Symmetry: C3
Subunit: 370 residues, 3 copies
C-alpha cells in the first residue's frame, strides 16, 4: 500500500532465536517497515559442531548464502530418481556458495565441518510463486519445531504430527510404534540436531549451486577500494524462475562504492565481515539512513533509492540480496559520461571546465579510493 513511504531505514538485527541441540536459528521480524517495503524477511541459521537441519519447505523461494562454514544439503524433488540406500544425488556446499531453495520443496542440511556453519537465507515472502501470504511459513517433516517466526501465530509440531498414527501406519504400510516415531510427539531436540558418530555417504540437473566468493569472475577490481562480484540468471540460469540475484561487495580501506541505485529491484544488504559508513537517499534528497553498518546487521535499499558506502578503518565486506533474476544498477559517476556536456552545465550551473572534469576525470569504476 504505502509499504515503502518510509522516511527512515534501520540496520535491523534478529528479533527471535531458537535454541537447538544441533544448531541455532535467528530470525528477523517480518513486520519491520524496512522488510515490509522490500517484501522480504531474512533468517540467520547457524549449525553447531556437526549440525543437521531436519527437512522442511516453504511456499516461497529461498536464496541462501553460506558465509562461514561448510556442509552438505539434500533436496527432496518429485519424480527425480534417487540415483545417489536410495537417496537423491545429495549436494555438498562450501563457504561463499549460493543456493536457491525452490518453494514447496523440502530440504535437509548437514554440517560436515569443524567450524560451526553460519548461513543467511533471504525469504522471498512476496515472491510470485508464493500464493499464501506475507507471513513466512515453515513446514517441517520431522522433529518438534520451535516457532521461528512468532509473528505468524500472533507448541509447534511437524506435519506428520497432525495425523493419527493409525493413519500413517496404514499409509506407510507399517506398525503404529514406528508411526508415532514419525509424529515425534516426544522429541525435544528442536529444529536442528547433531548426527552422532558421523554420517555415511563418503530440471533434476539444474545446477542450483554457485559460489559467489570466487574472486575470479567479478565485475570491478580496484586494489585500493576493493571489488564486487554479482550473481544472476546469466551464469546461474536457475535464478531466472525465482527472480532473485545477489552481490558480494568488498570495500578495502576507506574504499568507496560510488552513489549507485537499483532500477528494477529492491535490495537488502548483509554485513558479513567489517564495519563502514553507509548513506541512503530518497526523493527529497533525504538521508533516510546515514550511519554505520557492521557484521550481523541488515540494511534495506528501496529500489530507486540512491545509496553509497565506504569501508571503515577496519574495512567493510557484505552481501546484497536483490529481488530480480537480472537486477541492473548504475553509478552516478557513470551517468555523467552518458548525458551531454551542455546538459550537465545547464543542470548544475557549471562551466565546461568543471563538466569536462567530472567525466573524463577518474576511472570507469564505481569503486573509488579517496
Amino acid at each position: 500500500f504505502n509499504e515503502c513511504q518510509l522516511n527512515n531505514l534501520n540496520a535491523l538485527e534478529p528479533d527471535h532465536r531458537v535454541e537447538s541441540e544441533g544448531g541455532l536459528i535467528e530470525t528477523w521480524n517480518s513486520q519491520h517497515p524496512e522488510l515490509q517495503c522490500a517484501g522480504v524477511t531474512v533468517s540467520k541459521r547457524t549449525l553447531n559442531r556437526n549440525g543437521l537441519h531436519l527437512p522442511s519447505y516453504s511456499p516461497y523461494p529461498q536464496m541462501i548464502i553460506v558465509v562461514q562454514g561448510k556442509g552438505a544439503i539434500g533436496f527432496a524433488f518429485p519424480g527425480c530418481p534417487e540415483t545417489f540406500d536410495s537417496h537423491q544425488k545429495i549436494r555438498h556446499f562450501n563457504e561463499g556458495d549460493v543456493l536457491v531453495i525452490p518453494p514447496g520443496v523440502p530440504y535437509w542440511t548437514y554440517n560436515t565441518g569443524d567450524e560451526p556453519v553460519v548461513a543467511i537465507s533471504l525469504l522471498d515472502t512476496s515472491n510470485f510463486n508464493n500464493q499464501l501470504d506475507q507471513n513466512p511459513r515453515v513446514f517441517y517433516l520431522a522433529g518438534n519445531p520451535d516457532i521461528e517466526h512468532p509473528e505468524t501465530m500472533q507448541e509447534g509440531g511437524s506435519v506428520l504430527s497432525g495425523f493419527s498414527k493409525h493413519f500413517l501406519a496404514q499409509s506407510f504400510n507399517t506398525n503404529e510404534d514406528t508411526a508415532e516415531k514419525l509424529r515425534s510427539p516426544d522429541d525435544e531436540r528442536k529444529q536442528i540436531v547433531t548426527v552422532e558418530g558421523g554420517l555415511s555417504v563418503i530440471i533434476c540437473t539444474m545446477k542450483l549451486h554457485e559460489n559467489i566468493a570466487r574472486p575470479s569472475r567479478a565485475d570491478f577490481y580496484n586494489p585500493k577500494a576493493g571489488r564486487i562480484s554479482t550473481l544472476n540468471s546469466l551464469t546461474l540460469p536457475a535464478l531466472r524462475q525465482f527472480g532473485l540475484s545477489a552481490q558480494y561487495v568488498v570495500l578495502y580501506r576507506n574504499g568507496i562504492y560510488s552513489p549507485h541505485w537499483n532500477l528494477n529491484a529492491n535490495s537488502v544488504i548483509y554485513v558479513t565481515r567489517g564495519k563502514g559508513r553507509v548513506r541512503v537517499v530518497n526523493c527529497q534528497g533525504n538521508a533516510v539512513f546515514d550511519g554505520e553498518l557492521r557484521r550481523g546487521q541488515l540494511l534495506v535499499v528501496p529500489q530507486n533509492f540512491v545509496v553509497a558506502e565506504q569501508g571503515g578503518e577496519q574495512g567493510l565486506e557484505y552481501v546484497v540480496f536483490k529481488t530480480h533474476h537480472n537486477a541492473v544498477s548504475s553509478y552516478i559517476k557513470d551517468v555523467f559520461r552518458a548525458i551531454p556536456s551542455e546538459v550537465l552545465s545547464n543542470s548544475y550551473n557549471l562551466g565546461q571546465s568543471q563538466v569536462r572534469q567530472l567525466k573524463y576525470q577518474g576511472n570507469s569504476g564505481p569503486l573509488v579510493n579517496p
Copy 2:
C-alpha cells in the same frame, strides 16, 4: 488483512442460487476466508433440457468441468473468422468429463444438447493476473435481464451491457430501426441468464483453433494407478497448452473401498476440492503441525487446500471420486512416501528416531503409488 493465516477450514456449500427459465446457477460467496486465501470463487451451473446460457464474458478466466450432461458451446473470439448455410464460428461440443477454459473478456454461449440437465462447476480465477479490475467476480451479459449471481459483489438489479444504451444511440450504432435495437435492451426477458429454447437450435440439432477443452475422466489416465484404492488423472499445461496463458490445472481422483490417498501436498498452488461422487475423510495439516480440518466430506461440497499445506483423503464404503482445481497451469505436488525414499537412510533414523530396520521398511514397502489401501 490476514488471508491464508487460518487455523480451521470449513467445507462449503452453495450460498446463492439463480432460478432461471431453463437452468440453475449456484454460487459460493467469494468473501469466504477459505476462498479468499485461494483468490478464487466457484459457480455450479445446471443447464436444463434445451436450456441455453445467454452469452457473456468475465474479466478473468474460468476452468469448468462438465460432470453430468452434454451440450454445445461457442466463443466469440474477435479477430477470428466465421470460417465454419449460416455464418458462425467453429462451435465446440462438450461432454461430461471435459474441462472447459473460458478466456477473460471473450463472450460465450452454452447450449444443452441432451435430454438430461447438464452440470458443470466453474472455478472463477478472479485473482488471476489477467483480471485488471478487482477481486469480486463480474459477468457481462449481452442479452436479457439476469439476476445478480454473486450478490456479494453488490454489497438487487441487473441487465445486459446493452440495457444501458438507449435504443437511439444503439439503433444508430448498429444501423438498425428503433424496434430491433429496442429489443436488444431486452426490456422483456424474465427468463434471466439461462433460457429454455423449446424446439432447440437446428444449427446443432491459434487463438481461434487452440484446443481449450479436454477430457480428464476417461480411463486414459496415466498418472498414478492402484487397482485397490483407485486412480488419479491429471490435466495440466503439458497436455492442454492453452492453460499456460491462464495459469490453471486440475486433477481427477477416484478412491475405491477403503481408498487411501497417502499424505501429499501441492508444491506451488492453492487447491480447491469439489466432490462429484462419494463421501469420505479429509485431513488438512498446516505448518504448526495441527489439523485445520478433519472430518466427513460428502458430494456437492467444497474445500480449500492452501498451497504448501499437507492433505490426505480416504473414501468410505461407497468410494470417493472428486475433482480438484489448482491455481497454476502446472501445479506440482508430492507425497511423503516418495520423500522418505528420497532422503538418505541415516538422515531419517536421526529425525523421527528410527533404525536401519524400520527405516528400510518405509523405503521398500507397499505400492510405489500414493494411493494406498488398508
Copy 3:
C-alpha cells in the same frame, strides 16, 4: 477494499501544477478512485522555448504521447556504447504524435528544440510489477531542486545529490568541493525545468526502440471516411512495450461519426482528449452507465477493463488518445460478435426474427466505426 467497484465515473481534471522557470508540469492526483482502479496516473508536461527537463527517473515505466511540439530526449542506460571533446550516449529526436516509453530506473532528460511549447501526456504505470515500491508515484531528479509534482504523498524537494555531502560527493567523483557543492544545487530556483539561454549546440538494450509515431494513418487499421479512423501501436509494432505491458491507440472520430459499443478484454484504459469534443457512454457489468456526459479537448476519462465503452464524435470531430495497460490490449465490438454467433442464438437471446436477426448479422457492416 474494493477499488474497481466504482459507482459513477467522472472526467478527471489536472488538480495541480508546478511552475518552472523554463516550463510547466501538471499531474492528475493519484487518489482519484477512477485513477486507482486502473493503477496509474498521468502527468501533463510543457516545455516552453528552449525548455529543458532535468534528468530523473521513476521505479515504474512511463508511456508518453507528444501532442505538441518537437524536441529531443536522452537516456542514461547503464552499460552502453557512447558512439558520440565530448562523449554522450545516443540522443533521440522526437516530433509530435510520437509515443515515448521510459524504462524504470532509467534517467532521462528532454529539451524543446523548437519555439512552440512542447506538450506531452505522460502515463505513470505505477501499478506495474516492475515497481517494487508502492502505488504512490515517485520522481528521482539527478539535478536541480524540483518542487513536488505529486503532493498526494508529501502529507522543498531536493535531488538525489542534495542528499549526499559536498565532501563525500567531491570524493566519490574526485573533484574540488566547489564542484560537488554545485552538484547539490543549493541555491537553484529554476526548478526541474530550466531555460537554456542560446539553446544547445549539441542537439543541433541500448538498441531496442522506445518511441514510435501514432498519428500517421499508416498505423491505422480502421478508417471510416464519414466517422474517422483509428490507429494502434502495440507489442507487435513496438516490441519493447512487451516488457512494460502498455499499448497506445489513437482515435480519430469525425463529426457525427461513432465508435460502435466495444470493450477491452484484458486491460484498463485511460482516455485523454487531445482535440475535439463529444458524448461518451460507459456501461458496467451491471448493465448500467458508470459515466455519461460531454468530453472536451483537455480531460481524462477512465474506462475499466471489460467495461463497455461507446462514444459519438462532436461537431468538430474528436481526436483522443488511449492508454491500455497491456503490451497488446485486445478489444472487440458488440457488432463484430453478432457476426460470429449462430443465427439461431441471437434470436432466442433478444427475441428477434430471421428478419431482425439477419438484420444485425448482415446490415451491421464489418467495422467498429459507424457513420449515422
